[PDB]
Design a protein around this ligand. Structure first.
Ligand SMILES: [Mg+2]
Ligand SMILES: [Mg+2]
Ligand SMILES: [Mg+2]
Ligand SMILES: [Mg+2]
Ligand SMILES: [Mg+2]
Ligand SMILES: [Mg+2]
Ligand SMILES: [Mg+2]
Ligand SMILES: [Mg+2]
Ligand SMILES: [Mg+2]
Ligand SMILES: [Mg+2]
Ligand SMILES: [Mg+2]
Ligand SMILES: [Mg+2]
Ligand SMILES: [Mg+2]
Ligand SMILES: [Mg+2]
Ligand SMILES: [Mg+2]
Ligand SMILES: [Mg+2]
Ligand SMILES: [Mg+2]
Ligand SMILES: [Mg+2]
Ligand SMILES: [Mg+2]
Lengths: 49, 129, 62, 106, 62
RNA sequence: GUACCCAUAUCCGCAGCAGGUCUCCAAGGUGAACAGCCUCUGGCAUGUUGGAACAAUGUAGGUAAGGGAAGUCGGCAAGCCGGAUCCGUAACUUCGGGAUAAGGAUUGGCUCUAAGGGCUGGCAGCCGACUUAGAACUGGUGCGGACCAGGGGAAUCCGA
RNA sequence: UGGGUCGGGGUUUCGUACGUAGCAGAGCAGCUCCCUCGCUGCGAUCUAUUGAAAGUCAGCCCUCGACACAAGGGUUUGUC
């Protein structure tokens, strides 16, 4: 989903410096991934194999 | 600098004239510093200079083109802090080419964008935002 | 910074609601379009039941 | 338990959510028939005239949301049908709907 | 099983409309044997063919 | 001569064709009303088929923040007012009109008050229609709450 | 630690349900212990029950509360 957030900025020389802003922010769930396989690739004059 | 605020005043808008020059309404005829698209009306926002004429007001100010700065709009524009705000009516002031006010004092509130872009308009300091 | 709504009296968190700057100079904060329309159509917050003003005037909770 | 009879609370507001005004009650009755097909399993389903009245009690485009019905799976005894089992769906009236679960009756 | 003749004839006997004639659904085979106005009158006197009352049109609110 | 249809299916139109064809009877509520809308007596299966889904395009219908004709040959279409009561109604004119000119205020619900009649006897007693005006109370300024329904003004050309 | 249907919560939308009671109600009608807010009934609204009632997935979230169901079916497919 998406939830906005309030965050302090560090941009110097702008009308936003040292001010708070609300910006759109998306969230992704990324659980740990289980490793199963290993694949090898050789560089052939026609591409990868 | 100035950010992309919601443009709510296209060419042909009849806004109020919030100053003591003697003009009641201003008729937006174009927008300064804009590049057009095929069949697209040049829109104006807050703090951006435009060319305008006086439809109703003093006969000496009527029937002539002069620069103007929009100070209040009814189209809700998003502030960078993360809030939306909009005024009661579309209103602007008249200025010269350099960016100096023609009238002495202003009336009604003035948006923060225009107040920070044009220092001479904020010099009157009627009401900010 | 969390401001109280002018009509409903609830807390308006950053990124929600709108603001309304009257020609006089008053700046009101509206939580949503319901309260916005209720304020623009001149409805009494004390007469509207679900607002905090009605509860404070009728001593509902405390 | 081949002739057992039970009671259910079918939610028509969920099943006619997107049909349109002129086709709410017929689709509701088709959904009741499909619910009987899914619960009992007999391809022959007969609904009661009282249930038809209870469904059509508020017109076509205004169908009651929850309906408490009773399903009874009975043998046919007609020797012209392959299934030989039919589900009779009757309508029982109730005032409230909270805390009502599906129970079997004798 | 064709009761069109009986439905048409009982209306003319009772001097009412075709919608006000009520037939006994269980005695359909007995109604089908009727083919005369005398038979229709006998069945009406028996009770298989009756006249339904006029739909209510209340004037209390008026 | 006497049946029957007399019709979005018995007539004509090459047909069970949104076309055409002369008459009588015609209720209740709202409403000024045979307007529009809702019911009763009386008819009907939605007009030469149904099931499933709600893609583009299309045919009818309704809204949209800010601007309000800046689109278009053209305000085309669409949109505003639209009824009733009370004030006020211009230029011109053939003095009849313009005129519902234009421009304003009100409109609900429930309790009330006052006025507007007839008949019997030598000023009194009873009987029944809905109209008007005013005031009080009250509903989240909503009140022609659906339906019904005049945008207006300034001028030119022509035709009374 | 199967999915499904109800039900229970969370969230949410509207805005405070019927009934009841009131020494709240512009007032009206009947009655008399002639009545020091006299009694009864009617009476737009208003107050307490009441952040109440109502809907909430059919493309919302959680459940191991309750019911039934399940390895049940048809067609086709090999490289001396
Ligand atoms: Mg059969
Ligand atoms: Mg004849
Ligand atoms: Mg025809
Ligand atoms: Mg015709
Ligand atoms: Mg009438
Ligand atoms: Mg009348
Ligand atoms: Mg059909
Ligand atoms: Mg036809
Ligand atoms: Mg718009
Ligand atoms: Mg708008
Ligand atoms: Mg305008
Ligand atoms: Mg113009
Ligand atoms: Mg042209
Ligand atoms: Mg037109
Ligand atoms: Mg003139
Ligand atoms: Mg005129
Ligand atoms: Mg009186
Ligand atoms: Mg002519
Ligand atoms: Mg209700």
């Amino acid at each position: 989903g998406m939830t906005h957030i309030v965050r302090e900025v560090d941009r110097p020389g702008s009308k936003v410096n040292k001010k708070e802003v609300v910006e759109a922010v998306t969230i992704v769930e990324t659980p740990p991934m289980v490793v199963v396989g290993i694949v090898g690739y050789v560089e052939t004059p026609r591409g990868l194999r | 600098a100035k950010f992309r605020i919601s443009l709510g005043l296209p060419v042909g808008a009849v806004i109020n004239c919030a100053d003591n020059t003697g003009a009641k309404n201003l008729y937006i005829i174009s927008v300064k510093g804009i590049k057009g698209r095929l069949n697209r009306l040049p829109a104006a926002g807050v703090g951006d200079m435009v060319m305008a004429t006086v439809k109703k007001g003093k006969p000496e100010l009527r029937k002539k083109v002069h620069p103007a700065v929009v100070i209040r709009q009814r189209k809700s524009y998003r502030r960078k802090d993360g809030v939306f705000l909009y005024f009661e009516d579309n209103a602007g002031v008249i200025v010269n080419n350099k960016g100096e006010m023609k009238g002495s004092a202003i009336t009604g509130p003035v948006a923060k964008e225009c107040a920070d872009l044009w220092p001479r308009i904020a010099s009157n300091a009627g009401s900010i935002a | 910074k969390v401001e109280l709504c002018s009509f409903s009296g609830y807390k308006i968190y950053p990124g929600h609601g709108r603001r309304y700057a009257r020609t006089d100079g008053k700046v009101f904060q509206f939580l949503n379009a319901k309260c916005e329309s209720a304020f623009l159509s001149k409805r009494n917050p004390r007469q509207i039941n679900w607002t905090v003003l009605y509860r404070r005037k009728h001593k509902k909770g405390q | 338990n081949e002739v057992v009879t039970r009671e259910y609370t079918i939610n028509i507001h969920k099943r006619i959510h997107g049909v349109g005004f002129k086709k709410r009650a017929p689709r509701a009755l088709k959904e009741i028939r499909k619910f009987a097909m899914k619960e009992m399993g007999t391809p022959d389903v007969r609904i009661d005239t009282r249930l038809n009245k209870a469904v059509w009690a508020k017109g076509i485009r205004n169908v009651p949301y929850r309906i408490r019905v009773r399903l009874s799976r009975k043998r046919n005894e007609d020797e012209d049908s392959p299934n030989k089992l039919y589900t009779l769906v009757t309508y029982v009236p109730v005032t409230t709907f909270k805390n009502l679960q599906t129970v079997n009756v004798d | 099983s064709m009761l069109r003749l009986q439905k048409r004839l009982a209306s003319s006997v009772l001097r009412c409309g075709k919608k006000k004639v009520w037939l006994d659904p269980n005695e359909t085979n007995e109604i089908a044997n009727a083919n005369s106005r005398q038979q229709i009158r006998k069945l009406i006197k028996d009770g298989l063919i009756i006249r339904k009352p006029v739909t209510v049109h209340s004037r209390a609110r008026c």
